[PDB]
Design a protein around this motif. Structure first.
Motif, PDB file in Angstrom:
ATOM      1  N   UNK A   6      13.825   0.196   6.337  1.00 51.32           N
ATOM      2  CA  UNK A   6      13.814   1.089   7.489  1.00 51.32           C
ATOM      3  C   UNK A   6      12.471   1.792   7.620  1.00 51.32           C
ATOM      4  N   UNK A   7      11.899   2.232   6.498  1.00 58.07           N
ATOM      5  CA  UNK A   7      10.596   2.884   6.538  1.00 58.07           C
ATOM      6  C   UNK A   7       9.496   1.907   6.933  1.00 58.07           C
ATOM      7  N   UNK A   8       9.523   0.690   6.381  1.00 55.25           N
ATOM      8  CA  UNK A   8       8.466  -0.269   6.696  1.00 55.25           C
ATOM      9  C   UNK A   8       8.578  -0.747   8.140  1.00 55.25           C
ATOM     10  N   UNK A   9       9.769  -0.652   8.739  1.00 57.00           N
ATOM     11  CA  UNK A   9       9.902  -0.971  10.154  1.00 57.00           C
ATOM     12  C   UNK A   9       9.510   0.203  11.041  1.00 57.00           C
ATOM     13  N   UNK A  10       9.785   1.434  10.602  1.00 57.12           N
ATOM     14  CA  UNK A  10       9.351   2.602  11.360  1.00 57.12           C
ATOM     15  C   UNK A  10       7.833   2.726  11.368  1.00 57.12           C
ATOM     16  N   UNK A  62       0.855  -1.220   0.000  1.00 58.04           N
ATOM     17  CA  UNK A  62       0.000   0.000   0.000  1.00 58.04           C
ATOM     18  C   UNK A  62       0.879   1.255   0.000  1.00 58.04           C
ATOM     19  N   UNK A  63       2.005   1.217   0.713  1.00 55.42           N
ATOM     20  CA  UNK A  63       2.855   2.435   0.857  1.00 55.42           C
ATOM     21  C   UNK A  63       3.852   2.526  -0.299  1.00 55.42           C
ATOM     22  N   UNK A  64       4.530   1.419  -0.626  1.00 52.67           N
ATOM     23  CA  UNK A  64       5.570   1.572  -1.637  1.00 52.67           C
ATOM     24  C   UNK A  64       5.025   1.846  -3.034  1.00 52.67           C
ATOM     25  N   UNK A  65       3.699   1.806  -3.188  1.00 48.46           N
ATOM     26  CA  UNK A  65       3.089   2.012  -4.529  1.00 48.46           C
ATOM     27  C   UNK A  65       3.224   3.490  -4.897  1.00 48.46           C
ATOM     28  N   UNK A  66       3.708   4.306  -3.957  1.00 50.19           N
ATOM     29  CA  UNK A  66       3.882   5.761  -4.202  1.00 50.19           C
ATOM     30  C   UNK A  66       5.082   6.260  -3.396  1.00 50.19           C
ATOM     31  N   UNK A  67       6.075   5.396  -3.168  1.00 53.09           N
ATOM     32  CA  UNK A  67       7.220   5.797  -2.307  1.00 53.09           C
ATOM     33  C   UNK A  67       8.544   5.685  -3.065  1.00 53.09           C
TER      34      UNK A  67
END
Lengths: 77, 557
Positions: free
Chosen positions: A33-37, A18-23
């Motif tokens: 690091x972002x998916x763990x934060x 859902x997030x990396x589709x626009x990251x």
């Protein structure tokens, strides 16, 4: 225990799709690091589990995440 | 004297070129490692100051038609000959060293000056110490000085250049003993001098001792003695004696780089001198003083500012009155932190009015600013390369905006307009849609403090805080026609605002804002006895400057 392990699997996978589709893109360990934060107050980052699971959706169309050609990810659906 | 060249001198040079390429009337040939270069003596005499003596002195070369000139490159001599025969140089960026090497070989003054200018203009980031050693080997005081200052500025931030290790003593002494080291601390030069003597010791122990002394008592009170006990050659007694001498004498004095006070650079101020249009001054938050700066063009106005993480000042775009008996110029400049001047750089490709320059990932990004106005795609952006010294076209803006602001947060480009925001991703060269503001305000600027953008003002006192990790706009409070200038002071979000009433004087005062309190506590009220009126079109930016190089702005309280 196994049920909530599957629950954590669901969480990480959904978060990623859902997030990396626009990251951004991870040359090696950038987006992890972002998916763990994002899942910091949810559970344990579980590095080995997420590293083993991100390389399974590689051969599954969406988020190709080509391992060898880890320079440009497919920004498509 | 009548020296008309209309269709005569060019015709003469074309006839000479035709005689050269056809190998006509040639009486001298140059042998360069087996390669033949048939040419004439007249052109070599009028171009080079060595060939005139080569063809005048009655020695062996005078009658020798087959002269064997060595220690010269074939391509360099060929380009020198073709420059002599046509006047055009057409120099690249790679073969400049060997060209100057062989240009100084033949004392060819014109191409020497040309290459000297090309080298003095191209000391960008890396070839600094290399071309400095080049100008040291081939004594060139002009290049020597620019390169000296360039190193004093950048070398004191990397102090690990591979080329910096291979330097002659006198040059290293001149570099280290100078008081132009742009270092905020005294141990970096100590360890840099140290590593310059960790690659070469024993035979070079004399140089070791010399550089140790140079570091002075300020940096001699460190591990210098223990490190030396560790690496010194055995059976050395007088060396310890001469090292013990360096501790009390030789004028321990403070350096210059430590005076990197975080100040407030302003532009387009109310010229203290009446009809003068504008001026660029500065303010000191801690020293509570008002310093001035020299105008970069001295006549052009409406410029934009930007400050890199390395504390560098740049100026792009602007408009200058035509002075017939305001035209827009795409010129570029850079402020010198010690000489108090402005050295120009590669100009832009479009004449912009008030460009918004943003620094990110070592590149300068100029977003909007009336590029040409009549663009097919009216929304475009031109970025700058601080390393290659060139402009690179990138993905254009999505929508045409005016009086916009742009900042950089988390190594990403963020431009703000009336109500919309677009994140330019420099890596993927794309523009991703972001959150929209519920309030439509223009003529305002934004500040990039931490991980939050603070869009202040607009037409007012609108405080709309945006977060990148949250991607949402919210309000905090109202600041107690104000001209707001949000900025970062000492890792703390503050503002610089001025209020103006009817039949009243302007007052300058900065407040300290807190994140969780949503209140602008009174930090410091700028007294009018030191600072005078600024105006309306003034800009503000944060940067470190030197008080000794700059001069105080004289004005009656």
């Amino acid at each position: 225990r196994q049920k909530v392990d599957d629950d954590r699997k669901h969480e990480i996978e959904a978060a990623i799709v859902r997030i990396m589709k626009s990251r951004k893109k991870m040359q090696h360990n950038v987006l992890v690091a972002e998916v763990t934060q994002q899942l910091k107050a949810r559970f344990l980052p579980s590095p080995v589990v997420i590293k083993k699971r991100i390389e399974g959706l590689i051969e599954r169309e969406y988020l190709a995440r080509t391992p060898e050609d880890r320079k440009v990810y497919t920004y498509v659906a | 004297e009548r020296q008309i060249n209309t269709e005569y001198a060019v015709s003469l040079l074309e006839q000479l070129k035709l005689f050269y390429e056809q190998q006509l009337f040639t009486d001298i040939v140059l042998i360069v490692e087996g390669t033949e270069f048939p040419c004439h003596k007249m052109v070599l005499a009028t171009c080079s100051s060595y060939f005139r003596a080569m063809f005048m002195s009655g020695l062996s070369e005078s009658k020798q038609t087959h002269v064997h000139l060595r220690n010269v490159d074939a391509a360099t001599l060929q380009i020198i000959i073709t420059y002599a025969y046509t006047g055009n140089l057409a120099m690249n960026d790679s073969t400049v060293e060997q060209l100057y090497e062989t240009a100084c070989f033949l004392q060819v003054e014109d191409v020497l000056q040309r290459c000297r200018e090309y080298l003095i203009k191209k000391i960008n980031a890396e070839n600094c110490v290399r071309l400095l050693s080049f100008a040291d080997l081939f004594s060139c005081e002009e290049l020597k000085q620019s390169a000296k200052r360039m190193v004093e500025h950048k070398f004191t931030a990397v102090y690990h250049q591979d080329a910096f290790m291979q330097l002659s003593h006198d040059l290293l002494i001149d570099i280290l003993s100078s008081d132009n080291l742009n270092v905020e601390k005294e141990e970096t030069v100590r360890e840099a001098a140290m590593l310059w003597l960790e690659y070469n010791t024993e035979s070079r122990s004399q140089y070791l001792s010399s550089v140790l002394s140079q570091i002075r008592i300020d940096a001699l009170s460190e591990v210098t003695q223990r490190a030396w006990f560790q690496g010194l050659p055995p059976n050395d007694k007088s060396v310890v004696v001469q090292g013990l001498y360096k501790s009390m004498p030789k004028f321990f004095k403070p350096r210059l780089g430590m005076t990197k006070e975080e100040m407030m650079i302003f532009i387009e101020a109310s010229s203290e001198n009446p009809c003068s249009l504008y001026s660029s001054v500065c303010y000191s938050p801690q020293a509570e003083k008002v310093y001035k700066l020299c105008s970069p063009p001295a006549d052009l106005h409406k410029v934009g500012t930007v400050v890199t993480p390395d504390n560098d000042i740049y100026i792009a775009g602007g408009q200058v009155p035509l002075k017939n008996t305001f035209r827009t110029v795409n010129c570029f400049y850079w402020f010198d932190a010690q000489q108090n001047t402005w050295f120009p750089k590669t100009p832009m490709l479009f004449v912009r009015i008030k460009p918004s320059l943003v620094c990110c990932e070592g590149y300068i990004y100029a977003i909007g600013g009336d590029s040409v106005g009549g663009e097919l795609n009216r929304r475009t952006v031109e970025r700058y390369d601080t390393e290659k010294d060139e402009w690179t076209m990138v993905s254009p803006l999505p929508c045409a905006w005016q009086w916009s602001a742009a900042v950089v947060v988390h190594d990403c480009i963020y431009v703000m307009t009336l109500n919309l925001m677009y994140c330019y991703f420099p890596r993927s060269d794309s523009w991703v849609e972001m959150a929209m503001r519920q309030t439509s305000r223009s003529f305002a600027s934004a500040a990039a403090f931490g991980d939050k953008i603070f869009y202040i003002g607009g037409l007012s006192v609108t405080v709309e805080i945006y977060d990148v990790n949250k991607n949402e706009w919210k309000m905090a409070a109202n600041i107690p026609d104000p001209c707001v200038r949000a900025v970062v002071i000492s890792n703390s979000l503050c503002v610089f605002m001025r209020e103006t009433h009817l039949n009243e004087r302007a007052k300058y005062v900065t407040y300290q804002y807190d994140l969780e309190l949503d209140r602008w506590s009174l930090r410091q009220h700028i007294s009018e006895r030191v600072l005078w009126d600024l105006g309306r079109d003034f800009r503000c930016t944060v940067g470190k400057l030197y008080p000794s190089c700059l001069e105080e702005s004289p004005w009656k309280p």
